[PDB]
């Protein structure tokens, strides 16, 4: 674990929520990185070293914004328009497999933070 | 006509620069056309033109620091460095190699030629640590263009020096060498893990003349002798034929002309 994400916690159903991810060491600026969700894991969102190409899991499309800030090494996830079924443990990634964005995110994301939970409920 | 030139930066390095690189350093090693038992061939020494001799490796960091390392293509190892305006280079074993390396770096207005030479055994001496105990991976690798570098200037001693030749001449030469090492390389990038090498990988540095030459000489890729290598986990076995070494090896040193194969 050599990325330190921040940021969860508990939304109302419909409610908004940003997640953070920065590299104390590592420098994120030079690569792919993502966000990953597990309730299996899976896939939420990419964004290119650059910031000019992102892809979406179908699931969070339009609702979701992945977005970065090389100058603090920095990544980030907007959430938008938050679902129960958006209930799980988000965690960032940075992939050093490709030179590149791949389409759906593919690549081997080896360096990763250690995860939040992000809980959508009315209660409280 | 200059030789030419492969370039590598350590900043922001993937599995993918690093492919690539390495790559292209075996494609400017050899031509391929000379293979044996499907293993490729470096050039023969004999006859081959002082222009076609040498390679050199470009190194970058994140700091701007470079360095360039020279390699020899009938062997693809180092045989010197030039950070800034000196070079410097390993001790030549013959009169020939000695001459052959005055047509390096000919530029440089401070040109040394270090007593010792560049193989593991001396290098380990100097640095006062063997290749187990040194890390390999993107961070070391970083770290050794920056040692490097500070030599000419003082700021570096001669056994870390000597440290970050194993450093460079693993992850370049014996990566361009072997399939496996480069396999191994591309594992610590991945993870951006640092890690000295296991026996694996230094019994298969320290047989690459060996297995050259048990290739060359092989009988349909029987060997003669059976060769000794190690485990990951440090354990020995014997292998008897080329076969198990094609996923293994990428470059092989010139060792003999092929038999002759007849038009039928
Ligand atoms: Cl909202
Ligand atoms: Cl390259
Ligand atoms: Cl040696
Ligand atoms: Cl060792
Ligand atoms: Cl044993």
């Given at each position: 674990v050599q990325l330190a994400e921040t940021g969860g916690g508990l939304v109302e159903p419909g409610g908004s929520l940003r997640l953070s991810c920065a590299a104390?060491?590592?420098?994120?600026?030079?690569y792919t990185a993502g966000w990953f969700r597990q309730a299996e894991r899976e896939w939420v969102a990419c964004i290119s070293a650059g910031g000019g190409v992102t892809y979406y899991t179908g699931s969070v499309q339009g609702r979701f914004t992945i977005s970065r800030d090389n100058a603090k090494r920095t990544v980030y996830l907007q959430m938008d328009?938050?679902?129960?079924?958006?209930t799980a443990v988000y965690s960032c990634a940075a992939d050093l497999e490709y030179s590149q964005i791949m389409p759906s995110?593919?690549?081997?994301?080896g360096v990763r933070g250690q995860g939040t939970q992000v809980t959508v409920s009315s209660a409280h | 006509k200059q030789y030419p030139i492969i370039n590598f930066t350590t900043?922001?390095?993937?599995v993918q620069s690093y492919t690539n690189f390495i790559r292209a350093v075996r494609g400017r090693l050899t031509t391929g056309a000379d293979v044996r038992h499907e293993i490729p061939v470096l050039p023969?020494?004999?006859?081959?033109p002082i222009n076609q001799r040498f390679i050199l490796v470009e190194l970058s960091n994140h700091a701007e620091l470079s360095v360039t390392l020279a390699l020899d293509v009938?062997?693809?190892?180092?045989?010197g460095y030039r950070a800034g305006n000196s070079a410097y280079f390993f001790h030549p074993d013959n009169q020939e190699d000695a001459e052959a390396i005055?047509?390096?770096?000919?530029?440089?207005?401070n040109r040394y030629t270090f007593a010792?030479?560049?193989?593991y055994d001396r290098l380990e001496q100097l640095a006062g640590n063997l290749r187990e105990n040194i890390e390999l991976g993107n961070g070391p690798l970083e770290e050794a263009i920056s040692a490097l570098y500070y030599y000419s200037t003082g700021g570096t001693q001669l056994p870390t020096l000597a440290r970050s030749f194993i450093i460079c001449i693993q992850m370049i030469s014996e990566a361009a060498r072997f399939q496996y090492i480069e396999g191994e390389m591309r594992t610590r990038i991945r993870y951006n893990r640092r890690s000295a090498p296991d026996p694996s990988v230094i019994t298969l540095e320290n047989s690459w003349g060996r297995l050259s030459t048990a290739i060359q000489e092989s009988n349909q890729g029987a060997f003669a002798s059976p060769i000794q290598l190690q485990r990951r986990n440090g354990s020995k076995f014997s292998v008897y034929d080329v076969s198990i070494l094609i996923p293994i090896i990428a470059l092989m040193v010139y060792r003999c002309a092929p038999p002759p194969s007849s038009q039928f």
């Amino acid at each position: 674990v050599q990325l330190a994400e921040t940021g969860g916690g508990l939304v109302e159903p419909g409610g908004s929520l940003r997640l953070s991810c920065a590299a104390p060491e590592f420098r994120l600026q030079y690569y792919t990185a993502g966000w990953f969700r597990q309730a299996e894991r899976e896939w939420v969102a990419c964004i290119s070293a650059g910031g000019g190409v992102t892809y979406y899991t179908g699931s969070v499309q339009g609702r979701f914004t992945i977005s970065r800030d090389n100058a603090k090494r920095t990544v980030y996830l907007q959430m938008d328009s938050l679902k129960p079924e958006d209930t799980a443990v988000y965690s960032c990634a940075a992939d050093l497999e490709y030179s590149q964005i791949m389409p759906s995110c593919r690549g081997s994301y080896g360096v990763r933070g250690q995860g939040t939970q992000v809980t959508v409920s009315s209660a409280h | 006509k200059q030789y030419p030139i492969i370039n590598f930066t350590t900043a922001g390095a993937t599995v993918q620069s690093y492919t690539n690189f390495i790559r292209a350093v075996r494609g400017r090693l050899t031509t391929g056309a000379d293979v044996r038992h499907e293993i490729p061939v470096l050039p023969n020494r004999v006859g081959l033109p002082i222009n076609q001799r040498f390679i050199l490796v470009e190194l970058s960091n994140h700091a701007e620091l470079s360095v360039t390392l020279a390699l020899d293509v009938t062997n693809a190892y180092v045989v010197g460095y030039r950070a800034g305006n000196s070079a410097y280079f390993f001790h030549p074993d013959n009169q020939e190699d000695a001459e052959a390396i005055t047509h390096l770096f000919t530029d440089v207005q401070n040109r040394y030629t270090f007593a010792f030479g560049g193989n593991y055994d001396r290098l380990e001496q100097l640095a006062g640590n063997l290749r187990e105990n040194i890390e390999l991976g993107n961070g070391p690798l970083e770290e050794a263009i920056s040692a490097l570098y500070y030599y000419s200037t003082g700021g570096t001693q001669l056994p870390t020096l000597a440290r970050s030749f194993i450093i460079c001449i693993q992850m370049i030469s014996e990566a361009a060498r072997f399939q496996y090492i480069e396999g191994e390389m591309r594992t610590r990038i991945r993870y951006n893990r640092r890690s000295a090498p296991d026996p694996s990988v230094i019994t298969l540095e320290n047989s690459w003349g060996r297995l050259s030459t048990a290739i060359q000489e092989s009988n349909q890729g029987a060997f003669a002798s059976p060769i000794q290598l190690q485990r990951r986990n440090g354990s020995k076995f014997s292998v008897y034929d080329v076969s198990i070494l094609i996923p293994i090896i990428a470059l092989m040193v010139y060792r003999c002309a092929p038999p002759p194969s007849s038009q039928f």
